Amino acid sequence: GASSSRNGRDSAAQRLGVKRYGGQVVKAGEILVRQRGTKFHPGVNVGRGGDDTLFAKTAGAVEFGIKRGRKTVSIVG
Amino acid sequence: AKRGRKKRDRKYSKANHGKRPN
Amino acid sequence: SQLKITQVRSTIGARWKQRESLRTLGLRRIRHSVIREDNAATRGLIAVVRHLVEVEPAQ
RNA sequence: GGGUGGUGAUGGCGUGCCUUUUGAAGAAUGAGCCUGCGAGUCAGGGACAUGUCGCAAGGUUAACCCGUGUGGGGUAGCCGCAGCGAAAGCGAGUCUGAAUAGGGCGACCCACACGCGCAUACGCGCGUGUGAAUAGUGGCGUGUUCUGGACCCGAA
RNA sequence: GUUGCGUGGUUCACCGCGGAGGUAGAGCUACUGGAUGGCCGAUGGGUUACUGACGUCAGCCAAACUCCGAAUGCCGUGGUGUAAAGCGUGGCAGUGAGACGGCGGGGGAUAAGCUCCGUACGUCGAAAGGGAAACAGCCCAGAUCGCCGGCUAAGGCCCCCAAGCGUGUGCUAAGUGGGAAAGGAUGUGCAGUCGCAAAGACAACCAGGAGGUUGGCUUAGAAGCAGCCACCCUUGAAAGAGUGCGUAAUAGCUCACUGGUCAAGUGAUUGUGCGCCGAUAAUGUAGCGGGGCUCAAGCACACCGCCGAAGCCGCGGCACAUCCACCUUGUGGUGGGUGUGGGUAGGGGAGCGUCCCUCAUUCAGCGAAGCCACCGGGUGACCGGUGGUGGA
RNA sequence: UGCCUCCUAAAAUGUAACGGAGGCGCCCAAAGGUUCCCUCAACCUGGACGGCAAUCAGGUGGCGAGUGUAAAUGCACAAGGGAGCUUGACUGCGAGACUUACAAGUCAAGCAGGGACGAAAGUCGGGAUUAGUGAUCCGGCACCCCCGAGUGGAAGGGGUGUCGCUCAACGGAUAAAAGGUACCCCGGGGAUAACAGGCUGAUCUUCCCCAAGAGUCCAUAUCGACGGGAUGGUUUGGCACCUCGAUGUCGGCUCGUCGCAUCCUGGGGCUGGAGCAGGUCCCAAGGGUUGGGCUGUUCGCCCAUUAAAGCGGCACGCGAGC
RNA sequence: UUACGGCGGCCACAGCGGCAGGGAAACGCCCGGUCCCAUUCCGAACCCGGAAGCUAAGCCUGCCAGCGCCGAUGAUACUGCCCCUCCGGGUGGAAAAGUAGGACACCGCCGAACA
Ligand SMILES: [Mg+2]
Ligand SMILES: [Mg+2]
Ligand SMILES: [Mg+2]
Ligand SMILES: [Mg+2]
Ligand SMILES: [Mg+2]
Ligand SMILES: [Mg+2]
Ligand SMILES: [Mg+2]
Ligand SMILES: [Mg+2]
Ligand SMILES: [Mg+2]
Ligand SMILES: [Mg+2]
Ligand SMILES: [Mg+2]
Ligand SMILES: [Mg+2]
Ligand SMILES: [Mg+2]
Ligand SMILES: [Mg+2]
Ligand SMILES: [Mg+2]
Ligand SMILES: [Mg+2]
Ligand SMILES: [Mg+2]
Ligand SMILES: [Mg+2]
Ligand SMILES: [Mg+2]
Ligand SMILES: [Mg+2]
Ligand SMILES: [Mg+2]
Ligand SMILES: [Mg+2]
Ligand SMILES: [Mg+2]
Ligand SMILES: [Mg+2]
Ligand SMILES: [Mg+2]
Ligand SMILES: [Mg+2]
Ligand SMILES: [Mg+2]
Ligand SMILES: [Mg+2]
Ligand SMILES: [Mg+2]
Ligand SMILES: [Mg+2]
Ligand SMILES: [Mg+2]
Ligand SMILES: [Mg+2]
Ligand SMILES: [Mg+2]
Ligand SMILES: [Mg+2]
Ligand SMILES: [Mg+2]
Ligand SMILES: [Mg+2]
Ligand SMILES: [Mg+2]
Ligand SMILES: [Mg+2]
Ligand SMILES: [Mg+2]
Ligand SMILES: [Mg+2]
Ligand SMILES: [Mg+2]
Ligand SMILES: [Mg+2]
Ligand SMILES: [Mg+2]
Ligand SMILES: [Mg+2]
Ligand SMILES: [Mg+2]
Ligand SMILES: [Mg+2]
Ligand SMILES: [Mg+2]
Ligand SMILES: [Mg+2]
Ligand SMILES: [Mg+2]
Ligand SMILES: [Mg+2]
Ligand SMILES: [Mg+2]
Ligand SMILES: [Mg+2]
Ligand SMILES: [Mg+2]
Ligand SMILES: [Mg+2]
Ligand SMILES: [Mg+2]
Ligand SMILES: [Mg+2]
Ligand SMILES: [Mg+2]
Ligand SMILES: [Mg+2]
Ligand SMILES: [Mg+2]
Ligand SMILES: [Mg+2]
Ligand SMILES: [Mg+2]
Ligand SMILES: [Mg+2]
Ligand SMILES: [Mg+2]
Ligand SMILES: [Mg+2]
Ligand SMILES: [Mg+2]
Ligand SMILES: [Mg+2]
Ligand SMILES: [Mg+2]
Ligand SMILES: [Mg+2]
Ligand SMILES: [Mg+2]
Ligand SMILES: [Mg+2]
Ligand SMILES: [Mg+2]
Ligand SMILES: [Mg+2]
Ligand SMILES: [Mg+2]
Ligand SMILES: [Mg+2]
Ligand SMILES: [Mg+2]
Ligand SMILES: [Mg+2]
Ligand SMILES: [Mg+2]
Ligand SMILES: [Mg+2]
Ligand SMILES: [Mg+2]
Ligand SMILES: [Mg+2]
Ligand SMILES: [Mg+2]
Ligand SMILES: [Mg+2]
Ligand SMILES: [Mg+2]
Ligand SMILES: [Mg+2]
Ligand SMILES: [Mg+2]
Ligand SMILES: [Mg+2]
Ligand SMILES: [Mg+2]
Ligand SMILES: [Mg+2]
Ligand SMILES: [Mg+2]
Ligand SMILES: [Mg+2]
Ligand SMILES: [Mg+2]
Ligand SMILES: [Mg+2]
């Protein structure tokens, strides 16, 4: 038969996506949304990360918002 | 194919409610 | 005001949420009955397990 | 008439047992029958965990010695007693480090009571004590494990 | 999974609140592609019947399209509820061949009792009982034990077979019910939509239904009629170089179109309920389980009962977990609650029986063991008594 | 066969198939850091060589361009374009997270040292992000002087940094490895093939629906294309459900038995049926349905006949019957 | 308080475009490049020095739905959970598109005159 296994490979699922949702209390350094590119943008008190990870600079509550079209994640202390 | 069809059709009894193993 | 819920169908074959909602009302077996206040939480529970119980506004 | 014990016309229900399987009454395996026999055992101061008992900041001996014995000796040793570090080393600290930076590992050991250096009588610390599970240690029981054939049988 | 030691509501359910989404769907002049029909028109092609870029007007399509976009699900949080939630850490596991059914998908031929995933989906596995004729995986329902009590579930109630040859209103003629497609069909019941008509409707009948424009031509004749083709007017109730037969034609039997003639509906047409045909493999009716059933025992709707399980309730026995009150208030007992008690792998707990040893005690030649029979007993392994046999 | 990206994937995460698509085993001394500046493609208009498309000018143009490299997510605020200076492509760390069986993998504010750029604020522990990789062992090299087998050394070892595997079957059995067995053996499996059964019915088979046509005219005497719907379960398959502590495989012989989709005989309708013969369809399974040549054959062809030399099922009926 | 100047919130209901009107301070264009700084050429820009000129443009105001944008209600699609042979039905949610319409933004912090 035809050896049509020309496409049978894939990479590992990288477990992307939002890790801490709105109104959820987090500590500083705790990653909020791990993603490719800037699907979400760092808001107030949120750092970006070398691989666009959007961590918390400070403890407090996660909140999502819009900043001139760009959708952003911030922490309110 | 008759045996297969008859077995398949006997799900359509009230006691079976349209559902039956295999 | 004050609802009166009787379990009439088995939990055999019921989903997680139905079994746990019957547990939350405190229903244990067929023709068990419990009395609970008619609040939003109770009506949500009853809505989840509507087909397994009958309810009446019994004092 | 009633109750035992035997039988059982007649009516209903009713697909052996084991193994192994998604699933066997299975037309998958094994078993003719009976009687007898036939499979997680033992050793070790082994290892881990537990139950229990002794002693307890200690515990315990090994060989061996002496005893008619299972008893009495026997401190060599082992475990506990301080940790950190590759190590030198330092030590309730220590390692990394330039760091009176941060981190890693480690110490702040228990319940009840008294006693103090004393808070009006109620308490921090530190000491007796009493745990005769304290905290370990030794014995004994159990489960698991290690090395042995290691639950038993079976090749080519 | 179990079990020990900790922790304690952290689990889970429901309600509310705060959040991310790109599935379903949809949309696409919002992108990338696919793609239908118009209109204009760059080009190309042989001045331009050919091409028709781009636009423009509309209608569409997509797992790897998205200007959009749910329901669910998920994360957090606050209340409420819920005993046998959760979590940590140890001891001991087994399992790591799954099956089918529902829902969403891939592979396949949108085949497979196929295969591969998803699914706080189910059941079987490891689940007995009831229903499905029989029938792991469907429906009902989770068996602690006993009862010659009751109520129900699914499913049923003419006989097999417990309960209705139940009641009311209709439908079916096919044994449809009690298998099947494209499609065929003046079957039948019901709900609609138009034409004509007492100024006489449809069916049936007499009279009548033609002349020049019988052009093109095939040709023996095309003259409507072997075929394609003029593509229109007029004495007249109406009336075509003509609806179907038919000949080489000429011809011939008639239908379109009305009058009189006879006295009440008659034609089309749509959706539907129940039917018909299509229908068709090999041991024997063999596609209601059987008898039988339309005088329904079939179907639809409405209603009334009843039967029906190991479900629930009643009465009694047992057990496990946990809680509350008395007794040396934890070694724990007693009483009473509440909950629970299907189970394979497997975990934990507690026991029966055999033999041997030690200690104590007690039987035994007036008869032990072993064996046999009978009568009794315990929740189980099993136990006791009596007698027979027997001989330590 | 490892890694990366997408879809499948059912709007968290995750999710399989020998499902659908592609990439990677690098590159860059700037394509890194920082500071500052800029905006693209396409279209339209005009313009020596120059044209559709080189450079120029003006408009329009918010992203249709570009991004080192696949895809996705991003990026016009730019992460895209350009320029200046630089080496943070740091050392000592690291609260807290993500992910995860483990091993791994990933993010990280912030502190210190010493720097880069910047006027400062600040940013910089490589690159828009996610591939460009390899555990442990055993060794090598540089440094530190930690240990230094009586002592001083030294050898050797240790630490810190780093190097050596298409170990690519990419969690990496050995440093080191191909085949045959029909001479085969053993342990197993119906966990898995060959026969037969079962499901399916693509294929096969037998019909049917529609009717473009063919038939002088005329679709329907007969034949019917393009398409459509089914039957059967006799073909070749698909699946792998019973059987591997055995279900004997083809053909023949013998004996049958059943279906009817009928070969003959029987009864009919239509005919492009004058008659004789036929064609087609319908009904019909009671009986019959030959002997040879060739081939293991089934099948098939042939010979001679015949009323006819039917087609199938029954473990492709039948080896405890041959 | 103004047809003014000043910096943000917000990122189209705000944008873009069209048509008018506005110059007190201010924003601007504007005049130059001896003077810091600058052009991968250009004093265009950037930067510096000025106030002869002007609201032509930017900017501001007002009006326009034109190009866009926002957009219900209802209905439908889809759907959780039930009931049920599908068809279906109950119940809880509920789009996209389209329509009615909305809309030429709104809000916040100092100076000039006024006052
Ligand atoms: Mg991926
Ligand atoms: Mg990086
Ligand atoms: Mg099993
Ligand atoms: Mg099997
Ligand atoms: Mg057997
Ligand atoms: Mg048998
Ligand atoms: Mg076997
Ligand atoms: Mg046997
Ligand atoms: Mg050490
Ligand atoms: Mg420290
Ligand atoms: Mg002790
Ligand atoms: Mg022992
Ligand atoms: Mg062996
Ligand atoms: Mg455990
Ligand atoms: Mg919400
Ligand atoms: Mg949502
Ligand atoms: Mg997608
Ligand atoms: Mg869709
Ligand atoms: Mg397009
Ligand atoms: Mg077109
Ligand atoms: Mg989509
Ligand atoms: Mg395995
Ligand atoms: Mg597996
Ligand atoms: Mg599976
Ligand atoms: Mg499916
Ligand atoms: Mg299967
Ligand atoms: Mg499933
Ligand atoms: Mg059952
Ligand atoms: Mg049953
Ligand atoms: Mg039965
Ligand atoms: Mg009753
Ligand atoms: Mg009922
Ligand atoms: Mg019976
Ligand atoms: Mg009866
Ligand atoms: Mg009835
Ligand atoms: Mg009657
Ligand atoms: Mg009746
Ligand atoms: Mg019938
Ligand atoms: Mg029938
Ligand atoms: Mg039919
Ligand atoms: Mg039939
Ligand atoms: Mg019960
Ligand atoms: Mg039990
Ligand atoms: Mg039970
Ligand atoms: Mg067990
Ligand atoms: Mg004697
Ligand atoms: Mg005697
Ligand atoms: Mg004895
Ligand atoms: Mg006895
Ligand atoms: Mg006796
Ligand atoms: Mg005796
Ligand atoms: Mg996902
Ligand atoms: Mg999902
Ligand atoms: Mg490749
Ligand atoms: Mg650079
Ligand atoms: Mg750039
Ligand atoms: Mg480097
Ligand atoms: Mg850390
Ligand atoms: Mg510094
Ligand atoms: Mg400087
Ligand atoms: Mg940093
Ligand atoms: Mg890159
Ligand atoms: Mg090695
Ligand atoms: Mg030396
Ligand atoms: Mg020496
Ligand atoms: Mg050296
Ligand atoms: Mg280091
Ligand atoms: Mg591997
Ligand atoms: Mg190796
Ligand atoms: Mg040979
Ligand atoms: Mg063998
Ligand atoms: Mg099999
Ligand atoms: Mg086969
Ligand atoms: Mg068989
Ligand atoms: Mg078939
Ligand atoms: Mg399978
Ligand atoms: Mg056998
Ligand atoms: Mg026939
Ligand atoms: Mg004939
Ligand atoms: Mg015959
Ligand atoms: Mg006869
Ligand atoms: Mg011869
Ligand atoms: Mg035959
Ligand atoms: Mg055969
Ligand atoms: Mg045969
Ligand atoms: Mg044979
Ligand atoms: Mg035979
Ligand atoms: Mg002025
Ligand atoms: Mg100038
Ligand atoms: Mg003006
Ligand atoms: Mg709406
Ligand atoms: Mg809308």
Side-chain angles (χ1 to χ4, degrees):
Chain A
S3 298
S4 179
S5 66
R6 214 177 38 61
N7 45 24
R9 78 215 66 82
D10 185 23
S11 72
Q14 314 299 28
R15 279 81 177 174
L16 286 195
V18 161
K19 249 68 146 152
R20 295 290 184 270
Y21 292 90
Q24 189 172 0
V25 183
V26 309
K27 338 165 173 191
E30 145 151 18
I31 96 103
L32 322 168
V33 23
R34 159 117 55 191
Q35 98 269 35
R36 218 42 65 185
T38 202
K39 183 183 288 291
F40 309 66
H41 280 270
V44 47
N45 272 342
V46 154
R48 160 90 170 280
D51 71 336
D52 324 287
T53 319
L54 299 198
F55 43 99
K57 334 290 287 313
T58 89
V62 198
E63 79 158 317
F64 292 85
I66 298 278
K67 285 316 280 142
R68 186 145 64 91
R70 306 224 298 220
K71 99 175 73 93
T72 79
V73 188
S74 34
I75 306 112
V76 288
Chain B
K2 185 175 75 69
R3 183 193 67 129
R5 305 173 320 222
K6 290 207 29 183
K7 307 222 291 212
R8 236 131 39 220
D9 297 337
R10 63 176 174 173
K11 338 179 302 208
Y12 300 122
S13 65
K14 156 150 279 302
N16 266 195
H17 312 66
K19 259 191 309 153
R20 163 96 73 149
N22 320 49
Chain C
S1 68
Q2 172 105 324
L3 283 181
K4 163 35 162 23
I5 316 147
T6 279
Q7 183 194 338
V8 313
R9 313 226 56 111
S10 174
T11 45
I12 284 163
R15 326 263 290 242
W16 194 235
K17 293 185 187 293
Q18 286 130 18
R19 315 208 279 306
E20 307 299 305
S21 323
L22 283 193
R23 182 182 62 84
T24 313
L25 297 319
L27 283 174
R28 299 233 200 241
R29 63 193 82 71
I30 296 333
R31 308 144 165 215
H32 212 188
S33 34
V34 304
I35 313 269
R36 333 209 92 221
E37 310 68 338
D38 185 337
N39 37 57
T42 299
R43 311 194 280 299
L45 278 165
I46 294 167
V48 153
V49 296
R50 193 41 146 281
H51 62 282
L52 301 177
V53 315
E54 47 199 344
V55 317
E56 67 223 338
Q59 173 296 338

